[PDB]
């Protein structure tokens with residue numbers, strides 16, 4: 005009933021955060037801010053009315069069923085997680101985190117087949133590494149014999165590096181041993197601004 | 213000034229029940245309904261129900277019906293929350309809240325201007341489980357005078373955390389230890405990787421050192437090129 | 441020309457100056473006699489907005505009823521503010537009389553006569569009156585007793601049905617009797633009797649009306665989730681005594697889906713120690729009077745709360761209870777509003 009997007013915003017101080025929430029029913033919508041280690045705070049209620057203490061840098065808008073919270077001139081105290089709300093319903097949340105800017109850098113992609121030691125167990129883990137890229141936004145898709153995979157993958161991302169300001173991502177595809185031995189081509193496809201076209205790293209099961 | 217003060221955090225096991233309190237002040241306690249909202253990392257904030265100090269009237273969220281109880285003490289102006297049959301899914305920070313608009317005549321419940329500081333509740337088994345460490349082999353490609361990637365996959369441990377070093381901390385450059393992920397089985401897993409020159413694979417030995425204090429487990433694993 | 445406004449109303453009644461009955465005594469010093477030939481002007485080509493949930497007529501009646509009860513139903517012991525008050529607590533004569541509320545000079549009451557008016561929004565057939573109809577200040581929970589009926593269909597009333605924190609008032613178009621009795625010769629034990637054949641047919645009509653509001657979903661009734669006895673049970677006053685009746689059998693989902701056809705008997709008890717609905721605290725009253733204590737009432741409405749939550753279920757769940765006592769006056773004042781003449 006409440007669809008909030010995007011999941012994450014990685015912005016620098018001074019920039020503007022645009023956070024949207026799509027509802028299936030009209031009625032007073034509120035926005036909340038949760039700073040790290042602190043209780044959530046009411047920012048906006050009734051679509052566009054600011055709560056007490058909230059600076060005019062925060063503003064709410066609505067177009068059709070789409071509600072938007074815009075935060076201009078981001079400060080340190082503005083970063084955290086934001087939630088939209090209608091009655092007892094809340095959005096998934098939007099994480100606004102500090103991003104230090106640098107030149108665009110494409111990721112180096114590596115794919116790792118399951119170990120033989122692990123295949124003895126009964127499950128197979130396929131790991132795809134995206135190393136040292138910027139900006140944070142990147143898409144990973146798994147393909148098994150050229151068939152798109154969904155629901156069997158988990159991702160993890162590092163904090164922005166304090167030296168080179170890059171990010172690194174790890175995606176793991178998990179299959180049963182039996183299912184793993186049913187297919188040949190295991191491919192992982194990376195799309196990122198630093199690449200002119202999507203890059204695919206793959207291996208064939210069995211051959212080295 | 214309106215204030216909501218909650219009781220201290222606590223740790224619980226699955227099967228236990230829990231009770232937390234929310235002490236109110238700065239307004240006419242009987243005029244305004246009190247809500248309970250819980251927050252867990254990565255999930256939607258979840259409304260558990262409201263409670264009106266007048267008569268102690270309650271409305272519980274459908275998915276919690278039967279396991280939650282909300283009471284109050286008029287004299288001490290304190291609201292209470294009880295949650296039974298705890299599991300891991302109940303791990304969260306629990307807040308009591310009250311609507312911004314509340315008079316002796318009317319209220320709007322859902323604009324939560326007033327929050328308690330929150331009460332952390334962790335529900336977990338006392339059992340511990342050591343990790344399985346599998347190698348992420350450097351693979352027989354990636355140039356001759358370029359950079360290769362290798363690491364180890366640290367799978368199925370409980371609880372957090374594990375730490376990873378390489379060559380007893382002698383190797384730090386290009387090392388990335390990823391945040392763990394929670395699997396469907398309820399067990400954690402992470403990867404640690406390092407990029408090194410490809411020309412060093414036949415010379416330098418690379419060992420990941422996995423530490424898991426809760427299970428008292430220290431495991432070293434050598435990651436070398438597959439032989440074929 | 442006029443405009444919506446609030447003012448200090450005055451009450452009118454047919455109270456007997458000789459009656460020892462409590463409501464009669466109150467109305468004797470608080471109200472004026474009624475008008476033998478009331479005037480009503482049906483305004484033509486006039487459409488007006490109404491809002492029963494924002495009607496300050498309700499606030500004034502509440503103050504009156506509180507004033508009445510506070511001055512008439514005095515306890516032996518009053519426990520409030522951490523202190524103890526001990527007074528005399530003689531038995532009284534108790535039976536609510538109709539009370540009319542009227543506007544002073546410069547003000548007139550507009551009355552909505554749309555037969556299907558749900559409580560909020562525009563009204564086509566508006567008339568002008570000086571006084572409301574006679575309203576009996578019946579204090580009760582869960583069930584509305586001895587009130588007026590809806591003229592045509594059963595009407596669901598709420599400020600906002602999507603809001604689970606907002607009370608739902610169900611307005612019946614056919615009354616069903618509830619017959620409560622404390623027999624002569626445990627003295628505190630009692631019961632209420634209801635024709636299950638009549639009630640279940642009405643309750644079936646209620647769910648069918650509710651289906652019109654909730655996308656033909658399965659309608660389900662459940663007992664109250666918690667709270668003091670005043671809200672988890674049907675609480676009311678009969679002949680001065682405080683009754684608490686269990687309504688679990690009144691909302692039997694099986695009967696509105698073979699056997700339910702007959703007489704329904706609800707277990708009731710008379711309590712000497714109650715929570716005052718005036719929001720004060722605990723009051724201690726004397727034991728019940730002897731002989732048969734009986735009240736035959738018209739069930740004319742139901743107070744409901746709907747279950748909410750971040751769920752995805754094919755059925756809506758409703759529970760007896762509602763908001764507070766002010767809602768009892770709302771259900772009778774819903775078709776009225778005060779306007780100021782220029």
Ligand SMILES: *[C@@H]1O[C@H](CO)[C@@H](O)[C@H](O)[C@H]1NC(C)=O
Nearest residue numbers: 030031032560598599600603
């Ligand atoms: C119902 O609530 C919405 C906002 O939640 C409000 O705009 C609307 O006017 C309400 N409806 C009525 C009939 O009061």
Ligand SMILES: *[C@@H]1O[C@H](CO)[C@@H](O)[C@H](O)[C@H]1NC(C)=O
Nearest residue numbers: 553554555556557564565566
């Ligand atoms: C309003 O009055 C007219 C005139 O008799 C009548 O035909 C109509 O049914 C009335 N409408 C309602 C909603 O009662």
Ligand SMILES: *[C@@H]1O[C@H](CO)[C@@H](O)[C@H](O)[C@H]1NC(C)=O
Nearest residue numbers: 558560561562596597598601
């Ligand atoms: C009452 O009727 C109005 C039409 O003006 C509608 O907007 C509102 O939703 C109705 N309320 C209920 C409870 O049916």
Ligand SMILES: *[C@@H]1O[C@H](CO)[C@@H](O)[C@H](O)[C@H]1NC(C)=O
Nearest residue numbers: 591592593594613614645649
């Ligand atoms: C009451 O209203 C219902 C529809 O809500 C209707 O079916 C029933 O016949 C009515 N009963 C009367 C008018 O006595």
Ligand SMILES: *[C@@H]1O[C@H](CO)[C@@H](O)[C@H](O)[C@H]1NC(C)=O
Nearest residue numbers: 586587614615616737738739
């Ligand atoms: C109760 O309802 C019946 C018919 O429904 C009616 O005749 C009787 O007068 C009502 N009781 C009152 C108005 O006190």
Ligand SMILES: *[C@@H]1O[C@H](CO)[C@@H](O)[C@H](O)[C@H]1NC(C)=O
Nearest residue numbers: 619620621622623633734736
């Ligand atoms: C109410 O019930 C009693 C039995 O407890 C019975 O004697 C009496 O006749 C009933 N009253 C009516 C009006 O049916």
Ligand SMILES: *[C@@H]1O[C@H](CO)[C@@H](O)[C@H](O)[C@H]1NC(C)=O
Nearest residue numbers: 663669672673686687688689
């Ligand atoms: C009402 O009676 C039912 C039937 O046994 C019982 O389960 C319920 O607890 C009773 N309610 C109260 C408030 O005592």
Ligand SMILES: *[C@@H]1O[C@H](CO)[C@@H](O)[C@H](O)[C@H]1NC(C)=O
Nearest residue numbers: 688689692694695698699700
């Ligand atoms: C509902 O009615 C059925 C059939 O008469 C009966 O067996 C059952 O006990 C009733 N339940 C309640 C809660 O009254």
Ligand SMILES: *[C@@H]1O[C@H](CO)[C@@H](O)[C@H](O)[C@H]1NC(C)=O
Nearest residue numbers: 635636637638701702703704
């Ligand atoms: C209930 O009322 C109906 C009339 O609607 C009547 O026929 C029936 O006999 C009554 N049941 C009992 C037990 O008196």
Ligand SMILES: *[C@@H]1O[C@H](CO)[C@@H](O)[C@H](O)[C@H]1NC(C)=O
Nearest residue numbers: 585586676677735736737738
């Ligand atoms: C309802 O009215 C009847 C007759 O007018 C009366 O006997 C009964 O006690 C009243 N009920 C209540 C709860 O006041």
